[PDB]
Amino acid sequence: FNNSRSDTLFLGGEKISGDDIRNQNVLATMAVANVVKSSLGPVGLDKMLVDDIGDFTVTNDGATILSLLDVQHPAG
Amino acid sequence: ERTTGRQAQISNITAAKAVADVIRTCLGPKAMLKMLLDPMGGLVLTNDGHAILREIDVAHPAAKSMLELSRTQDEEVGDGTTTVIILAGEILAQCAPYLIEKNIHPVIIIQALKKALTDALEVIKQVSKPVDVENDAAMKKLIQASIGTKYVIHWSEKMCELALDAVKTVRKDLGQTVEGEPNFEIDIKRYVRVEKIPGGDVLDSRVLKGVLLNKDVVHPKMSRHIENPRVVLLDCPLEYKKGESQTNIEIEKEEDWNRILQIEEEQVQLMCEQILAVRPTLVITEKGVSDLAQHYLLKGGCSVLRRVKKSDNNRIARVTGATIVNRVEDLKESDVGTNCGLFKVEMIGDEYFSFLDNCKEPKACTIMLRGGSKDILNEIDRNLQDAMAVARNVMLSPSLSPGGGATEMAVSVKLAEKAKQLEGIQQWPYQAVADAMECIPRTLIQNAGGDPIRLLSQLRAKHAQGNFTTGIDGDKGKIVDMVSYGIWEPEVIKQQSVKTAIESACLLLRVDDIVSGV
Amino acid sequence: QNPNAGLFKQGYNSYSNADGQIIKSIAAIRELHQMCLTSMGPCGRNKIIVNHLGKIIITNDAATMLRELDIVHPAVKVLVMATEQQKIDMGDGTNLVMILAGELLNVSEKLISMGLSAVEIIQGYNMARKFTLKELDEMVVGEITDKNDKNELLKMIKPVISSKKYGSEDILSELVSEAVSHVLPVAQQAGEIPYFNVDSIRVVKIMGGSLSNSTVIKGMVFNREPEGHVKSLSEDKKHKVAVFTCPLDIANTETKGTVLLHNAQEMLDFSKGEEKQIDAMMKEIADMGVECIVAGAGVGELALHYLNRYGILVLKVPSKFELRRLCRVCGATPLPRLGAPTPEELGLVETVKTMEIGGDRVTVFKQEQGEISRTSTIILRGATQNNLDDIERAIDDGVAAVKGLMKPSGGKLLPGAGATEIELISRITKYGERTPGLLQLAIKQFAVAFEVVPRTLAETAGLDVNEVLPNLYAAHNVTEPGAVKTDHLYKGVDIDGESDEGVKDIREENIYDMLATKKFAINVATEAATTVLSIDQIIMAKK
């Protein structure tokens, strides 16, 4: 389950088009949005955000979680 | 990378359970030893609860929160570090089947933990017994709990005198409905700060009322004690000043030296003349003091003490009343040496001291520790901190609670009795709190070797009929009353243990997601 | 390289009990336990069972599942035999034994993980069982007077149709209660002769119509047509019937007696021989008052001709299984010979006619208010043949449930729909903390194991377990200023398909469980749970 191996159009990088990237745009924005879906509202709950050094912090603020959220895909 | 859904709830339970499981056998005087193999090839066989987990590095963030919880818990109470970690870890362990297998929402459990915390603190106050904090014989038998099984057991009577005389100076006992009650606030950290002096005997350890300074007097021959001292505190050092211009002093010709030196001797004399105008017997400068300023104040009949910290001058101002002044020309007439008994240059162990001590208590004392070596001083130090920590818990509330699993089991019985009228979905996570209360007397039995099922069943049935004061003996392991063998811990140990456990339980249940990366 | 130790028998896989083999045995039941959790209740689920012969079967009843499943593991095999214990002695409550005995072992894992000995676990349930059976005798609320009235039979049959066929509960109740009252006599103070056999109610079905057009006959219905030219009997009372095992033909010998043909001259004598002998035998049968002859064997051509002149209905029943139950209505006996219809072997029938059922003509056998019949027939009609067959299985289980209403204490009743299990939770935990010793651990967990019944009905109904269950626990917990406890014994588990703030009462719909069903289910569930806890290890050999 992936999208690769164009096998044509010689280029210095990969190319994904069609319904392939349309599914990747949905899967990327879904995992990013699922982060703050449990923190929405006053009844929402917080979470721990771990850095690369191994430290972490916990906050229920959605603006802080999204600022510390690492999104790999450009769609997210 | 990312852990979401119920998987993070599993990792939060596994992390807190693994940290607790290590020290579950570290509770009690009979606690079993732990072998920790270091990555460098060494090993640590000590059973100390805090010394083990400190050398253990953990990965999961909830495991690090349990380590930081014990660090904050150690600042409140000096002992019972393993008691809080077991209780905080077992509550999440008992709520684990309800959170997953029973599919109970975490907010429902967290809301039930807030009601279980209030009910638990009320039961502790019911089973607790009053104690007289003004009785000297009663306070010594209390502090003795943090004394025995240590090298200070022989001097214990003097160890209590160092702890009691220290808390009595800092304590402020007041109450009313007007300005409020301080609840007997005592700060051991800042005001009670110990000073370790090498040499002498442990019996020679005294509680000094005042401040102590190790810096000596700038002159070898000086007055050893002052009848009526006049203290002068100031910031700006005493030295030849510099102009506001680019002026530089370079002297080549031999007859031009006395021209600048006469100006240097004159300007320093004017700075010392401003001090001597009030005829002080003592001079204390925050910064350094030039040799010329030392001579002018030498013939002026006053002692000079160079280089005193600003934080020291604030404590010097309380034992004296000297007003802090910045510029030497700004010295106020409000600067006085009143309420200062003597100034002592006394040397103990080839080390010059300074004693500003007076006959009154300015809310802060100074502990003078003596011994046979530095290793003995470090032993008395940490043992006095544990002696003052138990003394602090007794002075911050006049109540004692039975130990050895008596209070832990008594609460579990009262929580189960109240749970009968608590009907509704919050009853299920509530009963898990009482089951976690039984874990503390369970580890004491497992460390003892007796049958855990038979004893806990007879121990819980003992509270349901007999008095709540019947606990478990540490040395034996058989059900006994705490009246015969007391083991009376202060309630503050039980207070903070239950409060921080529910807060830690609500902390881990409040995090349903784990995300890594910046 | 790695040697082996602990298995001295032969090449095998050795499983030591120190690995929690008793827990793995319960885990194997948990796979089957979850199967029964979707069965019990009117909101339960149906399972598709593909037979080894390539037949599709869809049914709610779990006893059919366990019959089609081939079991090896003992802890599950004992539950299959325990299911047969509930299936043979009663026609209802099979899901109660499988779910309860499975939960008793589930809550035992908390005691096993605690370190409590298996023998001490068994001793706890045995003491709690005697505490339960003492309460089950006091949980009895009402009892039937055995008046056998239709309305009184509806109170028993209504909860039985539930958990099997839903939505037809009120429709099938009027059809079953009418057939029971026909074969169920009204008598008292006689316990010597058993009554209401399972064979007393026959169920037939035909395509077309619906359950509203279904009817109940007071006697047995035959599919075969009236071969003779006489379609039906007269309106005269007490028609005599004759059942003959020997076929209808010229008189023969009981041993062999095969007719052989040689020359055409004998065939002319064989024809005239069958003419005079049959006319002589059938005339004497009509002279004795017998207007109907039931032939278990074939009927000759000349036999039909003479019986039609005498006005005797010819009825053939080649099936011997139908003739066995046929003797329970009129009382006739089959005759191996022919020509001697002894009046002691002759029966009595009020009405024999031919009715059109579903478009096909059938000859019935019935009566009106005389010579009481021990066999009845339920004629079912429906559009879907598959669903109509499942209704037959639900009615047959309802007939065996009425069998529990006989002498062995079947009149007493307990509140159903999860009402009884909740009260037993508070009563047993009251005995748990009261009884000193280590038994309090297993006794209290024994009451917690009853929480599966209300939770199962709530999970199958789609209701929130976090709402109905805690409201149901507070429903039975009240403070009454007096000795007699009141307010509500009637709070059950709710069957709603259209919601309902709170829960309802048992008194509204009169849905209850029988004492003979509940008391027998507890004994079987405990002995099944005791057997599993008694096995700490297994031993097998090479086949």
From Swiss-Prot, chain A:
Taxon lineage: Eukaryota, Fungi, Dikarya, Ascomycota, Saccharomycotina
Function: Molecular chaperone; assists the folding of proteins upon ATP hydrolysis. Known to play a role, in vitro, in the folding of actin and tubulin. In yeast may play a role in mitotic spindle formation.
Record localization: Cytoplasm
Residue window of the full protein shown: 5 to 80 of 559
Family indicated by similarity: Belongs to the TCP-1 chaperonin family.
Protein name: T-complex protein 1 subunit alpha
Effect of residue 44 to E: Temperature-sensitive
Subunit-structure text: Heterooligomeric complex of about 850 to 900 kDa that forms two stacked rings, 12 to 16 nm in diameter.
From Swiss-Prot, chain B:
Organism: Saccharomyces cerevisiae (strain ATCC 204508 / S288c) (Baker's yeast)
InterPro entries, alphabetized: Chap_CCT_gamma, Chaperone_TCP-1, Chaperonin_TCP-1_CS, Cpn60/GroEL/TCP-1, GroEL-like_apical_dom_sf, GROEL-like_equatorial_sf, TCP-1-like_intermed_sf, TCP-1_chaperonin
Phosphoserine PTM sites in chain numbering: 245
Domain of life of the native organism: Eukaryota
Function of the molecule: Molecular chaperone; assists the folding of proteins upon ATP hydrolysis. Known to play a role, in vitro, in the folding of actin and tubulin. In yeast may play a role in mitotic spindle formation.
Keyword set, alphabetical order: Acetylation, ATP-binding, Chaperone, Cytoplasm, Disulfide bond, Nucleotide-binding, Phosphoprotein
Quaternary structure, from the entry: Heterooligomeric complex of about 850 to 900 kDa that forms two stacked rings, 12 to 16 nm in diameter.
Predominant place of localization: cytoplasm
Localisation per UniProt entry: Cytoplasm
GO BP of this protein: chaperone mediated protein folding independent of cofactor; protein folding
Any one GO cellular component localisation term in the record: chaperonin-containing T-complex
Cystine connections: 359-365
Protein's UniProt keywords contain Calcium: no
Name assigned to this protein: T-complex protein 1 subunit gamma
Protein family (similarity comment): Belongs to the TCP-1 chaperonin family.
GO molecular function, one term: ATP binding
Swiss-Prot record, chain C:
Cross-link Glycyl lysine isopeptide (Lys-Gly) (interchain with G-Cter in ubiquitin) per UniProt, renumbered positions: 9
GO MF, any single term: unfolded protein binding
GO CC field: chaperonin-containing T-complex; cytoplasm
Subcellular localization, as worded in the UniProt entry: Cytoplasm
Pfam families: Cpn60_TCP1
Residues with PTM Phosphoserine: 499
Paired cysteines (S-S): none
GO BP term, example: protein folding
Gene3D superfamilies: GroEL, GroEL-like equatorial domain, TCP-1-like chaperonin intermediate domain
Sorted UniProt keywords: ATP-binding, Chaperone, Cytoplasm, Isopeptide bond, Nucleotide-binding, Phosphoprotein, Ubl conjugation
Main subcellular localisation: cytoplasm
InterPro entries from the UniProt entry: Chap_CCT_theta, Chaperone_TCP-1, Chaperonin_TCP-1_CS, Cpn60/GroEL/TCP-1, GroEL-like_apical_dom_sf, GROEL-like_equatorial_sf, TCP-1-like_intermed_sf
Role according to the record: Molecular chaperone; assists the folding of proteins upon ATP hydrolysis. Known to play a role, in vitro, in the folding of actin and tubulin. In yeast may play a role in mitotic spindle formation.
Known partners and oligomeric status: Heterooligomeric complex of about 850 to 900 kDa that forms two stacked rings, 12 to 16 nm in diameter.
Assigned protein family: Belongs to the TCP-1 chaperonin family.
Name of the protein: T-complex protein 1 subunit theta
Gene designation: CCT8
